[PDB]
Design a protein around this ligand. Structure first.
Ligand SMILES: *[C@](O)(CO)[C@@H]1CCCN1C(=O)[C@@H]1CCC=C1C(=O)NCc1ccccc1
Length: 710
C-alpha cells in the first residue's frame, strides 16, 4: 500500500535539554520556527505525499459529492431582539460563512445586515465576537483572517447598516461591552510585540489590557481601565450589569472555571471613564467561578461552583458582601450540572441542566428560585438561546445526533406558557428512523462508570464486523453533548459505520469532580477511560481493533495521539486534529500558558513527572511484539492555527516517521496535512469544512479498505 517514501528530515542531535535531571533530546526543535525555509520545505514535502494518498481512491470524490448534497440544507440561529429590531444568522446551505439578517418585526421582510462572504474570495474572513449597544442602534463586530484568534473590531450604525470609521487592532481573547450611555465600548488588547501578529507566529500572549473605546475617536485615544503588570497571565473581561450601573470585571488566569470578580459603580467615577476605574475587589481570589446572571439594585445573582461542583445560584448583596451572608437562590443538584442561566422578562430565570449528558430547560422565579415551567425536549442538546432581562420572549435551539434540529419560541407575556416550533428543517437523504442512539455506561480501569453514546443503523448484528468511529475530548470542563453531524452520518449510512462518543473524565459532564478526575496528576484517567471505551465497543461486538478509528481535536488530538502510543494494538486508524503533542513546551507559545490548569507545567518537577509519561512527542516507541505496528495515522493542522501552534503536529509527525515509519513491519501510513489560510477551526468556511471531512473519511476508507455503500 505505501507507494511513497517519507521525506528526509534533519535531526538536530545536539538539541538536548535538562528537565530536573532528565535529559530530553528534541531533534526536531527547528520545526518550531514557522518562517524558516527548512520548516516551509518540510510542510511542502509532507503535503506532497499526503494529498495524492488521500485522493487516489474514488471514495474521496463520492464522499465529497454526498457531503456537498447532504450538507446543503438551510441553517438558522435563534432570532434575537436588539432595541426595536430582530436579527438572526442564516446560511442558505453551502455559503462559506453564515450571514446576519435584520427585520423590523417578527412578520416583517428580512434583509442582509452583515455578509462576511463578500470580505474574501474563499470565506477565510470570519465573524469572531460581536456586541450591540444597549439601545440596539450601534453594532461592534470582530473579524478574524485565516482562522487566527487575532481580531479586528469594526463598527456599524444599525439603521441603514452604515460602516463607521472606528477600527480596533490588537484584539484577542476579548470582551465587547458597551456602556448604557451609548458613549463607547470595553474591549481587550495586547501590547505591541516584535515580529508578526497574524496567526503564523508562536509568540506568547501576556499583559492583556482592558480598554474603553469612545465611538467616533481614534484607537490611540482609548482609555486604559484595568491592567495587571505584576500578573502577566491575568485576563480581565468586562460586562455591564443589566441596569447599566456597574461594570463587572471577571479576571481569569488559565482555563479553570474560576474568576476574581471586581466591580465598578459607574455613577461613582469622579468624571466618567477617564483612567483606571475605582474597582471594588468583591471576590479577590481564584477559588470559585462567579458568572453574572442579573441584579436588582445591589443584589447580584451569580452562577457559581463555590462549594458546589455541579453549580448553583447565589445572591451576593454588594452592601453585605461577606460569604456567610450570601443567599442560595437555587441550590446545587446532587447529580445534574447547571450549565448556564439567563434572566428574561425582568423576573424569570431560564436554567439549562445537563442530566446524564442530555439537556433539560426550565423557567424559574427570580425572587424565590422556585421552578415554574419545564420546556419539554427530546434527547439532545440546547445549542442556542436568546432572551435577556428586558425581553419578553425566548428562543432556543435544540439539536441531536439524528436531526438538524428545531428552533422554539415562547412568548413569556402569556399566563400559560406554550413554547412553539419556530423553525425546523428536514435533511432529505438521511431518514432518522433508520438509526438509533443508545447510551451505555462502561467501567473504566478503576471501576468508574463512564457514559458513552452509540449511534448505528437499526437491526445490525453485533458480530464485530462494523467499522467504528470513536470520538473523545476529555478536558477543560467541556461537556461533549449530542450534536448533528452530516459528515458522521455519511460514515454510518454510506460506509456502514458505527459512531461512538465517550464522555471521559476531564470533561464537565458530571461537574467539577468529573473535570478534576481528568487533569494534572490524573490526566492518565482520560487515556484509560478512552481505551476502555474502545475495549467495550470491541467486547460487545460493535467493531474490532482493525476496523476501529479514533478521532479528537485540540486536547482531543492529544487524547488520540497518546492512545496510539499507549495501545497501538487497539486501533486501526487515528485522526488527530490540531493536537497538543509537545506536552513539555506547550506553555511557551501563544495562549498555551492558559492550559497549565489542566496539564501542569514542565517547569515544575512534580508536573514534569506526570507529563513525560504521556506526552505524545516523547512516547513514540516501536511496539515490542513482531505482530504489532502503529495504526494508520493522520494529523491535520493549519498554518494559521495560533490556538495550538502547528509545530506540535510537525514535530510529532517527524518523530512518528523516523522512529516507527522506518521500521520494516510498519506498513500503515503516518501522514500530516497542513492546510493554508486556516486555523484552529473556528470560523472555517464551508468549502474547507467539506474538503476536511472528505480527507478524513477517505483516509479511513483507504486504510481499512472500506467499500462505499451508495
Ligand atoms: C483545544 O483543546 C481546544 O481548542 C485547545 C488545546 C488545549 C485546550 N484548548 C483550548 O482552546 C482551551 C480549551 C477551552 C479554551 C481554551 C483556550 O485556550 N482559550 C483561549 C483563552 C481565552 C480566555 C482565557 C484563557 C484562554
Amino acid at each position: 500500500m505505501l507507494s511513497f517514501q517519507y521525506p528526509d528530515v534533519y535531526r538536530d542531535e545536539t538539541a538536548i535539554q535538562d528537565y530536573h535531571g532528565h535529559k530530553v533530546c528534541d531533534p526536531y526543535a527547528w520545526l518550531e520556527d514557522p518562517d524558516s525555509e527548512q520548516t516551509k520545505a518540510f510542510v511542502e514535502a509532507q503535503n506532497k505525499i499526503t494529498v495524492p494518498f488521500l485522493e487516489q481512491c474514488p471514495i474521496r470524490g463520492l464522499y465529497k459529492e454526498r457531503m456537498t448534497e447532504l450538507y446543503d440544507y438551510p441553517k438558522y440561529s435563534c432570532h434575537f431582539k436588539k432595541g426595536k429590531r430582530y436579527f438572526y444568522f442564516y446560511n442558505t446551505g453551502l455559503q462559506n460563512q453564515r450571514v446576519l439578517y435584520v427585520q423590523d418585526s417578527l412578520e416583517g421582510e428580512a434583509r442582509v445586515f452583515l455578509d462576511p462572504n463578500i470580505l474574501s474570495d474563499d470565506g477565510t474572513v470570519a465573524l469572531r465576537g460581536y456586541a450591540f449597544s444597549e439601545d440596539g442602534e450601534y453594532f461592534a463586530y470582530g473579524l478574524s483572517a485565516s482562522g487566527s484568534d487575532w481580531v479586528t473590531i469594526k463598527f456599524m450604525k444599525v439603521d441603514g447598516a452604515k460602516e463607521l470609521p472606528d477600527v480596533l487592532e490588537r484584539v484577542k481573547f476579548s470582551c465587547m461591552a458597551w456602556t448604557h450611555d451609548g458613549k463607547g465600548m470595553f474591549y481587550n488588547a495586547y501590547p505591541q510585540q516584535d515580529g508578526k501578529s497574524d496567526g503564523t507566529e508562536t509568540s506568547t500572549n501576556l499583559h492583556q489590557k482592558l480598554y474603553y473605546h469612545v465611538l467616533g475617536t481614534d484607537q490611540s485615544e482609548d482609555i486604559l481601565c484595568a491592567e495587571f503588570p505584576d500578573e502577566p497571565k491575568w485576563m480581565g473581561g468586562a460586562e455591564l450589569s443589566d441596569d447599566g450601573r456597574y461594570v463587572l470585571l471577571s479576571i481569569r488566569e488559565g482555563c479553570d472555571p474560576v474568576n476574581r470578580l471586581w466591580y465598578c459603580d459607574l455613577q461613582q467615577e469622579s468624571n466618567g471613564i477617564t483612567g483606571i476605574l475605582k474597582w471594588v475587589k468583591l471576590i479577590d481570589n481564584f477559588e470559585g467561578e462567579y458568572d453574572y446572571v442579573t441584579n436588582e439594585g445591589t443584589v447580584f445573582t451569580f452562577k457559581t461552583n463555590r462549594h458546589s461542583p455541579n453549580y448553583r445560584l447565589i445572591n451576593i448583596d454588594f452592601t453585605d458582601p461577606e460569604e456567610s451572608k450570601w443567599k442560595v437562590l437555587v441550590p446545587e443538584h446532587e447529580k445534574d450540572v447547571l450549565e448556564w442561566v439567563a434572566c428574561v422578562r425582568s423576573n424569570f430565570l431560564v436554567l439549562c441542566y445537563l442530566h446524564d449528558v442530555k439537556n433539560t430547560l426550565q423557567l424559574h422565579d427570580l425572587a424565590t428560585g422556585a421552578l415554574l415551567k419545564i420546556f419539554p425536549l427530546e434527547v439532545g442538546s440546547v445549542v442556542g438561546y436568546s432572551g435577556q432581562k428586558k425581553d419578553t420572549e425566548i428562543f432556543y435551539q435544540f439539536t441531536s445526533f439524528l436531526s438538524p434540529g428545531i428552533i422554539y419560541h415562547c412568548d413569556l407575556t402569556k399566563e400559560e406558557l406554550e413554547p412553539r416550533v419556530f423553525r425546523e428543517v428536514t435533511v432529505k437523504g438521511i431518514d432518522a428512523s433508520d438509526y438509533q442512539t443508545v447510551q451505555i455506561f462502561y467501567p473504566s480501569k478503576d471501576g468508574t462508570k463512564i457514559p458513552m453514546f452509540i449511534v448505528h443503523k437499526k437491526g445490525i448484528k453485533l458480530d464485530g464486523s462494523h467499522p467504528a468511529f470513536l470520538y473523545g475530548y476529555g478536558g477543560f470542563n467541556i461537556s461533549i453533548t449530542p450534536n448533528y453531524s452530516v459528515s458522521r452520518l455519511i460514515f454510518v449510512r454510506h460506509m456502514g459505520g458505527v459512531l461512538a462518543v465517550a464522555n471521559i473524565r476531564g470533561g464537565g459532564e458530571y461537574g467539577e469532580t468529573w473535570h478534576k478526575g481528568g487533569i494534572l496528576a490524573n490526566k492518565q484517567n482520560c487515556f484509560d477511560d478512552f481505551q476502555c471505551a474502545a475495549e467495550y465497543l470491541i467486547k460487545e461486538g460493535y467493531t474490532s481493533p482493525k476496523r476501529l478509528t479514533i478521532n479528537g481535536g485540540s486536547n482531543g488530538g492529544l487524547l488520540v495521539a497518546t492512545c496510539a502510543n499507549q495501545r497501538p494494538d487497539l486501533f486501526g486508524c487515528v485522526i488527530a486534529q490540531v493536537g497538543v503533542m509537545d506536552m513539555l513546551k506547550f506553555h511557551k507559545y501563544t495562549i498555551g500558558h492558559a492550559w497549565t490548569t489542566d496539564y501542569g507545567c514542565s517547569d515544575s518537577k512534580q508536573h514534569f513527572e506526570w507529563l513525560i509519561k504521556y506526552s505524545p512527542l516523547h512516547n513514540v516507541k516501536l511496539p515490542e511484539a513482531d505482530d504489532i505496528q502503529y495504526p494508520s495515522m493522520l494529523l491535520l493542522t493549519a498554518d494559521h492555527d495560533d490556538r495550538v501552534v502547528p509545530l506540535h503536529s510537525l514535530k510529532f509527525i517527524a518523530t512518528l516517521q523516523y522512529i516507527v515509519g522506518r521500521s520494516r513491519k510498519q506498513n500503515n501510513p503516518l501522514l500530516i496535512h497542513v492546510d493554508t489560510k486556516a486555523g484552529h477551526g473556528a470560523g472555517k468556511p464551508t468549502a474547507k469544512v467539506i474538503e476536511e471531512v472528505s480527507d478524513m473519511f477517505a483516509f479511513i476508507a483507504r486504510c481499512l479498505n472500506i467499500d462505499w455503500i451508495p
